[model samples]
Each structure stands twice: as structure tokens, then as C-alpha cells.
Target: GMQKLTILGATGSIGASTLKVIEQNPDKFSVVALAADSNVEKMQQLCQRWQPEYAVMANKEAALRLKMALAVLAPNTQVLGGQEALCYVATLEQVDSVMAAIVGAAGLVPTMAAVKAGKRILLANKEALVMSGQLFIDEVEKSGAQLLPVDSEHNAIFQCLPQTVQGNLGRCDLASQGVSHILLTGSGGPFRYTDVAELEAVTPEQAIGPKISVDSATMMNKGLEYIEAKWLFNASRDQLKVIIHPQSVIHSMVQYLDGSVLAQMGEPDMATPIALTLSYPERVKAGVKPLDFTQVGELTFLQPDFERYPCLALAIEACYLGQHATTTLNAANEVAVAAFLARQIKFTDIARVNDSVLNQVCKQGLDSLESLLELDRMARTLADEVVRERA
Candidate 1:
């Protein structure tokens, strides 16, 4: 029998790519449910082809219209709606796996629901882990859920780790797994070389995207990823490392206890990992063009200047403290990123807002969804004030 997969945020980029993977390996996988925020037409089209048992929409009215459209277009599918619907499909008894790819803080609840239900989870949303790492990991352990990495870097490390390693730091004997220190690669984005003098001149196009654009400017994305690496590898902040690899060809790397190093190389494709999560233990064809190393020239590595990217430094600091600090870091950064996108503040100030918000909310701790929501709201308020004052 095929593995029954439920896709969260199905109309988005990750969900769309996941469908492509399933299409190529029809024998191994089948869609049990498809979910999205509110893209009614796209969701309806997916139901028409995949014929999932349940189709879910976060938008109720959109789901109603889509339900009517699908009733005529594809009568077999049943439409479900709202927050509970999102949670319901995630833990559906029929679902063998879930692709948790919905972006930002909004993705936390459904992703956690899938984990609590003990399904194998392919995590694409960093905010979930960022917002509630300790609690999320607790739920995964309690439920015996399997977390296969869907992010390219984490997936690469997951593939690189030694098979027999059981212990935390001593596991795999790191030396023999050809894994020593993990090296996270980054594209450095568009502002890689922008100096302080040139930063204020940047237009929205140069800083497009939610917090991500601001993160690129200040390397806060790297900071968030650094915290992510800590939980994914079960490594200390000191053990988990970051290297600025502009090519992004070597998605990430690991150094063995014996001084040998291993790197996972590929084209800059998020879909590869998404497909891998869906068809793990057997790499399914992602339907993406293969990376040609010939055209890709030399790969360069740079030591990240903390002075240059204080976000990374702050992230490392938060990881060392281990008070569910990443949650505040993530929430604050998300709010800060939104402000930057709105052009309420100069890009350099992203760090200032994030720094302030993180400190303000760090003591709150991430215990439950409600608490996180409260803190997120509070942090965003502080961030908005900071941006307004700075502007």
C-alpha cells in the first residue's frame, strides 16, 4: 500500500512541488488530503487531479466556493474548513506522513498537530521549530514521530549522519561518520556586499519579501538557521557552526571526529528535499533538472563577521541560554522583517528591532500556542514602535 500523505499549505510552493514528486512516483505515494490558506482555484484543480479524500481550506468562504466548484468538477473530494480542519487533516488516521510547509508563525499549530499524531513529518516551516523547539521536540518524543528534514541543509546533514550513531555528541563517533562540525551554507542574498552608506538607498525590490528580505540584509536568516541547526543535530551552540558559502552548491557540510569532512552538494532547489521527505529511504525523482557541476565553478567559503551580521551572534547567544529563546528570536525577527518590507525602517535597523524584541520577550518562554500568540503580538507591537521611532 502507498504511504498516505497530507500536504499543509498545498497551494504554496512546497505543496506544489510535493505534488510533482507524487506524480512521478504514483506507486509509492498518494495524497490523502491537500490544504492551503485560500487559493480556491488552485486547490480545486489539485482535487480534480489527485482526488484526495479530504481537501481543506483555512478560509471558510473560499472552501465553500471551492467545495461547490469541486462538487461539479470532481465529485469524489470532500471539503473541510478552518483551523480545526487544518489540525484535523494533519493528524488524520489515514495520513502516514505530512509535509509541514506553510510559511511563518501561522504554520506552527498544524505542524505540531501532525507531530503529536506520530506521523512522519517533513518540516519546511522553520517558524514551528523556531517558535517552539523544546516543546515541539517533547511532543515528537512523546508521540514517537519521525522528523525527516525537508530543508536542504538539515536534510543533507540527516543524510550525512552515521547510521549506527545513538548518543548525542558521541554518537556516530563523529570521526567515522565523516562528520565533525556541521557547516551551514548561505547564498548571502542581494545585500551581501552592501555597505552601511548604501543600505538606506535600497528600494523595496532590493529588500522584497517579509522578514526574509530584512534577514538577508542583516543575515538574520542565518541566525535563525543557526538555532535550527542546534535542535536538528542535538549539538551545542559551540559545536554547530556557520560558514558563508556564496555558491550554496554545498548546501551544508559536516566534519568527522577524525577530521574528515563531508558535504551535500546540489542545485539551489528546495523541492529536492521536499520530494526526498515524501519518498525517503528511496529518492524519488523530484522532476527537477539535475545540477551540472561543470557549469558551477569554484565554491568559496568565508568566515562570517559577527560585526557584519550581529543577528548570527544574537542567535548563537540565544541557543546557548536554552530558554525557548529561539521563539522570541524568531517572532521578533518575523515582526522586524515585516516592518522592513513595509519600508517603515531602514534595513540596518532590522537588527535593532529584533534585538529589542528578543530581549523583551525572552523571559515570556514558549509553552503553548496561546502563549506564543500573545508573545508574538507583543513582540510585533514593540517592533512596530521601534521601527516608527527609528524612521
Candidate 2:
């Protein structure tokens, strides 16, 4: 029996890794829908291979171009356009599961649509929960949506939990399950030891994707995951903790009441977690290299320095401030990261801009999607102003 899947952000790294898992276990899954921002060529190649029933593009012009290309290459696959189509395909009756991998806030609505439709959601988009944790979890509970984390750290923690706790989904209580701490591990990025003065000179190429590389260097990626873990596992600020692991082999760990620590480790591959989510309780090949402890050296853990990673400290502070603060922080960071990438501001200015925007925005309850999106707009506008002043 093949599970029908809708792959959001079909051209991204997570999507590519997921397709690899599907490629390895063809008998277990089928691609029903594929969606992306504007990569027509990559989507066409995927369409030619998977021949999904629906292909969606968030950009209308790209959708038109893809529709024309698919006519010749994948005639049977229907082409759809815009955000509405992205949501449409995600909740389609034929789709048993959805890979919510669309990056940033643009993914929130479609990912929520899949949740409301009660599809088994493989969530890779941290913004989906980071922006609207309470609302997102509420929807999952209301709709009976099975929320399975796709990020390596969250998935690792999921694997380390007791079977009873794992079975409870989002409502699981760590203390009741004898779990004392959820240890989120991070690689601390390329600048973990670089001099603070030198961080200003890092090139976009040297840092990876300007946005992600900046987040990584600041350890904000870990902070965002901390917020996600809080919602996904019903954890408290005291219960969720993060430590720097440069090797990134021990994805995450769970410390129990009796001092026993359980961890999930692998070769730092995304496919391992994706495969686990795609085939729950049923093991499948992910095509990742096996870990060889013989050749691998000692792994070390260190405390994250707030002076070096202020963005992370900001995120943790925002986590306790409620959804509005987190939403505003995410939006502000996006603007600041983009500014740094464009050479308009120094890398260190990203935290300054985020801090300034957070201070400027009025913290309010985001009770509806429109309210949250409005707050997002307000934060981005303020962040832009801060960038101009700081630059």
C-alpha cells in the first residue's frame, strides 16, 4: 500500500532528501502533489520522474511557464498557480501526508491547511511553529492532525522519548514520562570560534545562504528549534535546553529522571529523519552512510555563549513573551539577515536590528491569521527602518 504525499518546497534541500528516501522505498510511497516557489526546471524534472497528479507554483508566471513545459513532458499532471493552489494541493483528499518544507512565513498557511485537513504533517518549516506555536498546536489537536517533526534535532528527541510519550503526539508530558531535559544539540556554525571583530567581514559565499549562515553563526537556528520543541512536545522553558556540539553527530538527547541519557545519532543526514517520519514504526533505507565509531573521534559539548550568539538569547526571551514576540522576532530577523547578505549592514548588525525591532513593536495577542500577518508586516517595516539607521 503506497502512501500518497504532497511535497511542499519540492526543490529545496529537505525536499531533495525526501525524494531520495522515496526513491529508495518506491513501494511505500507515491508523490501526489509537488509545489515550489519558482524553480520550473527542477520541478519539471521531478514531474517527469514522479508524475504527480498536481504541480503547484507559488509564482503565477512560473506556474504558467511550468504548465507549458509540463504539457510536453508530463501531460497528465495538472498545473496550478499561487498560494491558494499551494494550500489546495496540500489538503487534497488523495494526499495522505504532506511534507511542509516551504521556507519562512510563506509556508505557514499551506502547512496549516494540511493540518486542518487532518493530514499527517511532516513539518520541516520551523517558521510554521515559531510564528504561531499556540495556534498551530491548537489546530493539530482540533483536527486530529498527526504532527511529526522533520528537523534532525526534533526527530532525534522524538526517537529518544519513551514509547508511551511518543504515542501521545503533541500532548505528551515530559515530567510524567520521567524525562527531565530535552537536550538540543547544534554545530555552532562556521564562526563558533572566530573573533567577534572578524565576524563582520564574513562573505555570503563563505557563510552559506546569507540568511541561514547568519542564523547558524548566531545560533538563532537552535533558538528557533527551541521554540518549536516547546510547542511540539509541550515543554517548558526550564525543560528545554541547548548545547553546542561541533560534530553535529549526536542530533539530540533526552535526560531522564534516573540520570540515564538516551540519544539519536547518525551521519548528519536529513534523509534519516525524513525516512523515519515517512515510515513510522517501519524502518526503511535512507541511503545515508553508516556511522563508524572506530574512526570517529571524541565528541564534545560546550555552553552557548550569549555574547557571541545574542540572537539566540533574544529568541529564548521572545519564547516566554508569547506568540506576538516570536512572530515579530522571526519577521525582523528575516529583514536583518537579508540586509547583511546584501552588504547593506554588517553581520553583527543583524542582532542589533532584531533587538531594535523587538523593542519597537507593540506586543499584542495574535488571535487570528490576519492579525498575525499584520504584526509580521509591522515588524518587517520597523526592521527595515532599523537597518537603514544601523547601516
Models 1 onward score TM values of 0.92, 0.95
lDDT of 1 by residue, 273-367 (tens): 78777776677787878889788998888887776677888888877766356666666777677776777876667778778877776654237
Model 1 superposed RMSD (Cα): 2.6
The numbered model that scores best in lDDT is 2
Give the clash count for each candidate: 9, 0
Looking at model 1, residue 8 earns an lDDT score of 93
As a TM-score, model 1 comes out at: 0.92
- For residues 1-391, write the lDDT of model 2, one tens digit per residue: 7899999999989999999999998999889999999999999999999898999999999999999999999999999999999999999988899999998778999999999999999999988788888898889999998888999999999999988877676688889889999999999998888877787777776667557777898888888999888888888888888899998879999999999999999987899999999998778999998998986688998888888889999999998887889999999999998998888988778899999999887543238776888889999999999888975
User: Which stretch of 10 consecutive residues in model 2 shows the poorest summed lDDT?
Assistant: 361-370
